[PDB]
Amino acid sequence: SMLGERRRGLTDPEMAAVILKALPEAPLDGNNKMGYFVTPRWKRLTEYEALTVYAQPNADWIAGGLDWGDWTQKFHGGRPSWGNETTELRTVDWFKHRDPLRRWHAPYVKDKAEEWRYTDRFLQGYSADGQIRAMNPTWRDEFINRYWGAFLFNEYGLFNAHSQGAREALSDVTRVSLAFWGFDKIDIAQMIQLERGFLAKIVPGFDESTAVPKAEWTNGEVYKSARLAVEGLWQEVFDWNESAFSVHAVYDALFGQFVRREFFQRLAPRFGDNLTPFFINQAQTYFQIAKQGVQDLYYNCLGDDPEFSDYNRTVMRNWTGKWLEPTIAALRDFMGLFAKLPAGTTDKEEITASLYRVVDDWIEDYASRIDFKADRDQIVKAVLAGLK
């Protein structure tokens, strides 16, 4: 019918009259701010904090918890749903963390959706504009397809490294950041394949199958140590914090940044390739976004914890050293790829400058944060010893 059979209390005269009759004259409490009891990180409480902080039902026995008592149902054996036992790190309050970008689900998908839609438009413009005509054939059929493609398995592995953390994180603010850090990683992996798929459509004999790039990743030499480092960060680390810290403040910050920024983003433009950089712009925008969160958690909150500052720094300096080694090896194996480039692409002078940019940036944004004494010259020297 035009009116329908269902009567709604907001619009139905009889029902609405009954509701209005029962209403108080004014609100029964003037405090209309949800999450008012949460300690604001900034000037005034934000929507991000209100909607997130304390969603996790932790009891007081887990630093910061507002609830009480044991969990209602635990694992066979006794392990708690969530517990202090799932990570070496300690703190006065697990709810202290704050994403500098204040991302809850809505803003997060809004931004990624915009990127998806503009990406589609860009591709439609790029193809219609025939810009592929000026792209170097060898760089495309060999370096973008095989080597850039192989890198998708690296980002994919880093993505999966977040699975346990998605399950063990001890707070809402930390759980949301972790989820987003991981989701962005799989996005990148999928963006690498998207490009290969795009090329397949606009380049007659381009094969989009992951067969080639996968074999390179699983058996090649350029990414051998890279894959080993990933297989370890993912399936050999059972501490959700060591996983997040080591992946974002060690491995990806050194190896990942070098490959993405100092190799492909730097060399692709030289072969008339503006296509790949369009996607790296995304990967880097994501890297720099996550970095602020990673820094706020492990440094601002944990590393600078009013009671466990020293302890936490020790644990992270420990982790920093534990994974710095596999990261170095990864960078060395990758160095071999330079020998495959066409004569005159780049010189040892340039690559050395690019390595220091990564190392110096790393020391500035991560190493110095927990007082990790790292030597820029020895690191660059150790990696550099992987060329011809």
């Binding site: 709604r8 609100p27 507002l66 969990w71 209602t72 392990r79 949301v176 394949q193 795009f198 996968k214």
Partner: protein, 510 residues
């Protein structure tokens, strides 16, 4: 040079190949099953398309909320009883959405096939969205409603009362503690397929009937994401169907999961609907039979038959204990009203007629009790009467099931009245059914949750409330109330004067 691009499916086609082999590539969580690494997923999505489809929904939702709905004062023109009920409905559901994030993270880790991992991943993100959505509902009613207390601090106030303990069992711990597959059953195969999916829609129905257009706006949006989670649950079974361990363990974890979920929702959902509203949509006994027996127990479970799945052996028991379950529990919830974070109301004349009409015998038992309590002044602060006193006076002990955390009163209940009490290594335990008793006996270390009587033992009621911040802005008036009117609100002093001191009822067997 034709305009060309690439879509989600074109990339997804190669997603399964994303995972590779290596010695330690296996789940980090204990489990009796083996999910096939060739398992596929129903929806061919990638991170970017997922974000877009959700962003579009957010657009509509927040647009309606911030604009038209606010212009219509939708946050206010809602029945008092429902405004209170949403404090519980939205916040309790919130923790379910929240723990579901961790649960699917665990399932994402369990799956070995890339597509199955991707399926669970989509849910991880969805449950994050739902967490923020349920939070938004409370946030909105707090900002624009007739009574923000409770809506504004449920995350800490929900802690005071006993109903919250049971919610954590089915919506928190049941989702993440145990064999990943068991958790999947509690969350997806049972939780979502049997209860949440139908519940979320039902809630928008009761909401609309009571003037609430805010909840339908958000909850209907949440509903659009559930088909993916149903599929996740279905695929979980398909993924372990071929493993021999399945035929030996699946039907037991499922049964334990079914009993776990229904043990709480059968009483709780019916209570929230029938006693937390003014205008009724449908009798809970009718609803329950359709959801559990017809739709789930029949159609849904039926489709999994080819995978060895069978109707829970405890189904008959569940139906037998259900009829009066919600009615029995409201008596306890109201008697303990000072422990909540919401305001409760006794049934009015029209409602009593509705209850008697739909539940013959209701008036002679519950109705007369409520009228007795009201005439005695349970709604008036100067009466010095809290219904809990009536239970003590008439020797009707209230126990907490050690497993489900569900409160029960054997001597008064019109429903189940069985009671089993055991002592083990210096500790007493109280069970309300044979399924929960088996669980504890076989898995004692999985269930050590302290009940409210144990924690509050020897404590004076007003002190517990005060300590856990059960007060409104003025620092004197209670958040919880025994009526929904705007005048004569109970204060901390009104409670302190009662001199109510908690006792552990089980010690009477000493």
């Amino acid at each position: 040079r034709a305009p060309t691009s690439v879509n989600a499916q074109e990339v997804h086609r190669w997603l399964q190949s994303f995972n590779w082999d290596f010695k330690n590539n296996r789940t980090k969580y204990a489990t009796k099953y083996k999910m096939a690494n060739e398992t596929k997923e129903q929806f061919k999505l990638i991170a970017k398309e997922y974000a877009r489809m959700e962003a579009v929904k957010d657009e509509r939702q927040f647009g309606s909320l911030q604009d038209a709905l606010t212009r219509l004062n939708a946050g206010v023109r809602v029945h008092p009883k429902w405004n209170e009920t949403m404090k519980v409905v939205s916040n309790f559901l919130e923790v379910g959405e929240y723990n579901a994030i961790a649960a699917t993270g665990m399932l994402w880790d369990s799956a070995q096939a890339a597509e199955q991992k991707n399926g669970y991943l989509a849910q991880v993100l969805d449950e994050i969205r739902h967490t923020h959505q349920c939070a938004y509902v409370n946030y909105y009613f707090a900002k624009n409603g007739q009574d923000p207390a409770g809506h504004n601090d449920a995350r800490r106030t929900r802690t005071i009362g006993p109903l919250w303990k049971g919610m954590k069992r089915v919506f928190s711990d049941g989702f993440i503690s145990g064999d990943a597959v068991e958790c999947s059953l509690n969350l997806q195969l049972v939780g979502e397929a049997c209860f949440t999916n139908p519940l979320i829609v039902a809630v928008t129905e009761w909401a609309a009937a009571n003037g609430d257009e805010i909840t339908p706006t958000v909850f209907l949006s949440i509903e659009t994401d559930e088909l993916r989670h149903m599929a996740n649950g279905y695929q979980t079974v398909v993924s372990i169907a071929n493993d021999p361990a399945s035929a030996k363990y699946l039907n037991t974890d499922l049964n334990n999961a079914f009993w776990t979920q229904q043990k709480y929702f059968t009483p709780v959902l019916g209570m929230l609907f029938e006693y937390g509203s003014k205008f009724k949509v449908e009798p809970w006994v009718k609803t329950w039979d359709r959801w559990v027996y017809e739709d789930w127990g029949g159609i849904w479970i039926g489709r999994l038959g080819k995978y060895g799945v069978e109707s829970p052996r405890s189904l008959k028991d569940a139906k037998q204990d259900a009829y009066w379950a919600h009615h029995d529990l409201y008596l306890l919830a109201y008697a303990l009203w000072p422990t909540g974070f919401f305001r409760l109301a006794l049934p009015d004349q029209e409602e009593m007629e509705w209850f008697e009409a739909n539940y013959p015998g209701w008036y002679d038992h519950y109705g007369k009790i409520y009228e007795e309590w009201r005439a005695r002044g349970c709604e008036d602060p100067s009466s010095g009467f809290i219904p809990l006193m009536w239970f003590i006076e008439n020797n009707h002990p209230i126990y907490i099931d050690r497993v489900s955390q569900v409160p029960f009163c054997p001597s008064l209940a019109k429903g189940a009245s069985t009671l089993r009490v055991h002592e083990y290594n210096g500790e007493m335990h109280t069970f309300s059914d044979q399924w929960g008793e088996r669980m504890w006996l076989a898995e004692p270390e999985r269930y050590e949750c302290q009940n409210i009587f144990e924690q509050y033992e020897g404590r004076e009621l007003s002190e517990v409330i005060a300590e856990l911040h059960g007060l409104r802005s003025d620092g004197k008036t209670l958040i919880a109330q025994p009526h929904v009117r705007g005048d004569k609100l109970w204060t901390l002093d009104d409670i302190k004067r009662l001199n109510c001191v908690f006792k552990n009822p089980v010690k009477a067997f000493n």
